[PDB]
Design a binder for these strands. Structure first.
Lengths: 225, 215
RNA sequence: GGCAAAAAAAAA
RNA sequence: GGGUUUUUCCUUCGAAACACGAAGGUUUUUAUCCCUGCC
């Protein structure tokens, strides 16, 4: 029932400024310590700030003091993180964590937000062009065969793909975006089913790129005759 | 006077039912103010052990932690497939707080051969003057497996990108995407597009393909 | 033996 | 030696790493305080 929901990250240019927030539900933020923990792409976690209860005292990693500043609003049951003078090194996913109850878990962090990704870059955003990958056959199609959407040329991460608006989960594989020399991302999402049910069912993928503010649904079919 | 956490190792791989042990050593005293987390790819971390050794309410019993002075271990009595994750140790003894570089536990399972696929570049993408033939390896093990592209039997190099999923949480299989990127010229220029993969479920290397036009 | 006194500030 | 009067460190707890609070602890420094009268 307890839940933290961070938001407010995205693409920002070097020297720029952001504000993240952390919306608490399930418990009142005034009676625990709230911390922000960031995680670079593919690297490890790093503590950033925390504010402790009653005193409202804050503390910051050496990486970000002077630039970062953590506040809490007990009425909106929200904790915030104003970020100034942003640098490429600051590109990461940002988590807010609650410090558990002293008896229940000491200084352990017992609930975490799902994290909000901050991209520090000079580049400007592009949404993807999405192309279907069709199951290719020159004879009869009575087996299990695969199909998928190619999602090419976009920036920044992330995109979210969903087959038939969430109806299809078994055997779905959304590959991690790889970054082309172009400087844009591109990935492939594949799903497997027995072709016995190919002709009766429909295969649309729900692609969504909120940075670029793009939502596209392509409709995967077979090829020539 | 910042405390630094030194986790060991960076990666490791054990079979199901194996016993596995991670350790973190502290630069200086942290009392028993140490916590351990599990992080599955992409999702947020999860508390496994608080107070260096106490087990968090709800975690399985197979995870335990102990402290020997400044030497902290995290032990998983029986490995299970659900347990492929990345583990971090955290000191909360003083500020600033410090984690380890992280241990990435992989899982050992029987060899599983990939089922291979090739896709012609959709012509909507040929509507845009570029080519993306793409090759696929679904549900296989181990991770290390090699794709070669041929174009009219001409071996290709330096033009293809591979991407691989994380290990599966149920059967601990992998999956790979080799995407060859080319022009609209080079696609209707040559005729056959071969993709050969050499892996250990294969006595001999398997190759799948098609021709251009005849799709 | 039985009473009564008196009286400033620092550190773990 | 025994004290008075002020400080701190530590411990358990308060929704509690600091700050605030409650209940507790056993040490030691300052020749930089008192160890004086009465049947």
């Amino acid at each position: 029932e307890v839940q933290l929901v961070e938001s407010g990250g995205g693409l920002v240019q070097p020297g720029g400024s952001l504000r993240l927030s952390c919306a608490a539900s399930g418990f009142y933020i005034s009676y625990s310590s709230i911390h922000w923990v960031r995680q670079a792409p593919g690297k490890g976690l790093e503590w950033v700030a925390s504010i402790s209860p009653y005193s409202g005292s804050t503390y910051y990693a050496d990486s970000v003091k002077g630039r970062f500043t953590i506040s809490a609003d007990t009425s909106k049951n929200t904790a915030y993180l104003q970020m100034n003078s942003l640098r490429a090194e600051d590109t990461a996913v940002y988590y807010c964590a609650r410090q558990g109850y002293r008896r229940r878990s000491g200084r352990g962090f017992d609930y975490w937000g799902q994290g909000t990704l901050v991209t520090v870059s000079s580049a400007s955003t592009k949404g993807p062009s999405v192309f279907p990958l069709a199951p290719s056959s020159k004879s009869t199609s009575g087996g299990t065969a695969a199909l998928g959407c190619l999602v090419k040329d976009y920036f920044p991460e992330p995109v979210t793909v969903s087959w038939n608006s969430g109806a299809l989960t078994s055997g779905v594989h959304t590959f991690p975006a790889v970054l082309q020399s172009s400087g844009l991302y591109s990935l492939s999402s594949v799903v497997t089913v027995p072709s016995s049910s190919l002709g009766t069912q429909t295969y649309i993928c729900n692609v969504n790129h909120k940075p670029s503010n793009t939502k596209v649904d392509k409709k995967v079919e077979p090829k020539s005759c | 006077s910042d405390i630094q956490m030194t986790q060991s190792p960076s990666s490791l791989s054990a079979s199901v039912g194996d016993r596995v042990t991670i350790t973190c050593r502290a630069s200086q005293s942290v009392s028993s103010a140490v916590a351990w987390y599990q992080q599955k790819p992409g999702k947020a971390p999860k508390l496994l052990i608080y107070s260096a050794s106490s087990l968090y309410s709800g975690v399985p019993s197979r995870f335990s932690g102990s402290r020997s002075g400044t030497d902290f271990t995290l032990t998983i009595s029986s490995l299970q497939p659900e347990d492929f994750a990345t583990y971090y140790c955290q000191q909360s003894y003083s500020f600033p707080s410090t984690f380890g570089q992280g241990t990435k536990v992989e899982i050992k399972r029987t060899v599983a051969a990939p089922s291979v696929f090739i896709f012609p570049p959709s012509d909507e993408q040929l509507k845009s003057g570029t080519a993306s033939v793409v090759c696929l390896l679904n549900n296989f093990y181990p991770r290390e497996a090699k794709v070669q592209w041929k174009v009219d039997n001409a071996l290709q190099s330096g033009n293809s990108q591979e991407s691989v999923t994380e290990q599966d949480s149920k059967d601990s299989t992998y999956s790979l995407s080799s995407t060859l990127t080319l022009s609209k010229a080079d696609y209707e220029k040559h005729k056959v597009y071969a993709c050969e993969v050499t892996h250990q479920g294969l006595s001999s290397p398997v190759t799948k393909s098609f021709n251009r036009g005849e799709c």
